[PDB]
Symmetry: D2
Subunit: 179 residues, 4 copies
């Protein structure tokens, strides 16, 4: 089974989490794991002015999402929604939606946040979009049951472990369903 | 695989939908399907005063939910939440939550509503509870992509067909995962 | 203006929070504050055996919600929703809904959790019902620090942690935010209604 | 009181709704209403090739949101969220957030869909962000029928159906609800701010 870890990160927190998720998924025999990012939308000028951490993972196209059996989406908490960069990217998946290309595939979500709250709303409002595509949504249950998070007022050891678990669990389901 | 269609109905709309969901699930070879209701919480006096349709399906206990591979939950839209009767029942699943008894099992939701809106919020706020139990959430994608609905300002032919589809689709996933 | 603090509590955490909300609201001259609880639905024997806490607040009826200018709802987090007791009570407000009785009145929400997870969803899914009634929804955001009566203090409503074992009580930091929520909502109620 | 109708529109449906919201708001004496759009993020060539509609409304900056007493946000439904363009714009309001610039101001939301699905989620997930800013959230509920300027007319905010092909335009019934939303919010803004 093919697993995509698809993420947006500005300051590196989701980037760090995405590596942990990918590690977990890679523990599963038969899981082929790939990590990609959505494009930065800010001109580099503005990204640099804001102190961004330049991302170097391969950039995904909206259309290639169809190639995977499971997609694990990472986004920072942005006032209780996904980031504009992730939203912009998902707004470019209309062609896939019309063709049913993501229908029935596994989806799961992880996030990063400060200490102000909103991470639960970020995850569940991301689920909404996944459901429009007919994706099967995988929470982690029993920190939120909705998906792995990291809270920064670098991620903690325990936070990285939960992220690894999420990858391992989702990848295991993907192999169960697709070999 | 064992599929439970678990519902609350006051005036029969969810009851009718639950039969359709069960029909769909029963199309899947290897799916063993059961329909049960959550208890009415209103004293019969008050239920009758309100013009309720007495339900006669077997009553589920909170604890027996653990016996199934997939649970498809039906609730009317009650100001954009599940009904108090379904909420009360789910508030009695703390023992299952502590034991991880529903973890990883399939869940899906259908609803009934008037013409005032709220059915999307009812379904997605029901998903929240399912996620606390670690259940895998199955939307229907492409009326809402979140789950089958019926809108009454008896369910329509098309509404019953979508309900049948939801049962068939979820039951198929349950057999794929559990034989 | 009349302000109702309407709550459900099993083990007393929301009860303590509700008293703090009412204390804050009472600071506003011209705000008449009342605290009431929704009925317990569990049989007394089962409630007692579960370690439930008996409470002195009067029990509200659904009908009387119409009598207030602002209602501040408290509920524990129950798998990311309000409790069955609060949901059952709100399901009895159909008559108020049909007559527009709560339309335009202020609403705000506070909660409690064992270990944190689901509090955001409890508050926002309670807002949904308030919106069906046409109520104006008051989040707390992150208020100016000097407005809290405890120094060094979610944006959706005040919360408190009960612990996995339920034995933790609300801290003065948590209660300060609850008091602010009451004072803030009551101030708005007086601004709008005298 | 100053009221901003701030919107994003691709194909003009939200634009038409925004004009209706502004018309309603303008009915309130003492409400100064302005309509602005968030920037298009698509390159002009791609936007034009996609059949996008050019629009006369001035483009808002994030900073100027601080200048208003009420902000009514319009966005199409994009898989049950606000659009990427609105999300990108709101992600630029961190400075306002840090200074408390929008705290306590009124907010309300309207939307549009192709075939209905997701509109509720678009509105309520927009409310989340408004709550982080401490804004007071105004749902429309089901208002008294005589307050709509079209007879025989979700509770979360006004909506319109664009059709699967995008060719449907807002009906007078839909626009009447949008006009009501503007008038209602503007009335509240004047009540609170003069
Ligand atoms: C516009 C904006 C909004 C934010 N909103 C929230 C919020 O709702 N809650 C919170 O606690 N942190 C919030 N944050 C902080 C980010 O979630 C946090 O810094 C996260 O670690 C960043 O992840 P990244 O390093 O992968 O970009 C926000 C940051 C930005 C830039
Ligand atoms: C307290 C209450 C609240 C309701 N809230 C809504 C609502 O939010 N939206 C709506 O359109 N219908 C609403 N309804 C109507 C029910 O959703 C509708 O009648 C549904 O068909 C009933 O399903 P049942 O026959 O299975 O009980 C509500 C009904 C009750 C009793
Ligand atoms: C059925 C049930 C479900 C619960 N779900 C949650 C949960 O989602 N998250 C949480 O951290 N605690 C959860 N709790 C714990 C309660 O939120 C908690 O102990 C409560 O906040 C106490 O408030 P009270 O003393 O006012 O009843 C749950 C408790 C029960 C009985
Ligand atoms: C990427 C994308 C996703 C969309 N998602 C939805 C959807 O969730 N539900 C819906 O009924 N229509 C959806 N639509 C259609 C738009 O909501 C619709 O055509 C829009 O409301 C038009 O408003 P505008 O003319 O102001 O851009 C989507 C459109 C796009 C481009």
């Amino acid at each position: 089974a093919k697993v995509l870890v698809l993420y947006y990160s500005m300051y590196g927190h989701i980037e760090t989490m995405a590596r942990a998720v990918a590690e977990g998924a890679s523990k599963v025999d038969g899981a082929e794991v790939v990590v990609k990012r959505v494009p930065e939308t800010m001109p580099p000028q503005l990204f640099e002015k804001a102190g961004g951490k330049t991302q170097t993972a391969p950039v995904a196209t909206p259309q290639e999402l169809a190639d995977y059996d499971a997609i694990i989406f990472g986004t920072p908490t942005r006032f209780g929604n996904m980031s504009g960069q992730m939203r912009t990217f998902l707004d470019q998946t209309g062609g896939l939606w019309a063709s049913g290309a993501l229908y029935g595939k596994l989806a799961s979500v992880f996030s990063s946040t400060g200490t102000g709250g909103g991470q639960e709303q970020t995850i569940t409002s991301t689920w909404t979009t996944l459901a429009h595509h007919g994706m099967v949504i995988v929470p982690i249950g029993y920190g939120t049951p909705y998906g792995a998070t990291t809270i920064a007022g670098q991620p903690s050891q325990e936070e990285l472990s939960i992220a690894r678990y999420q990858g391992e669990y989702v990848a295991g389901l993907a192999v169960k369903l697709n070999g």
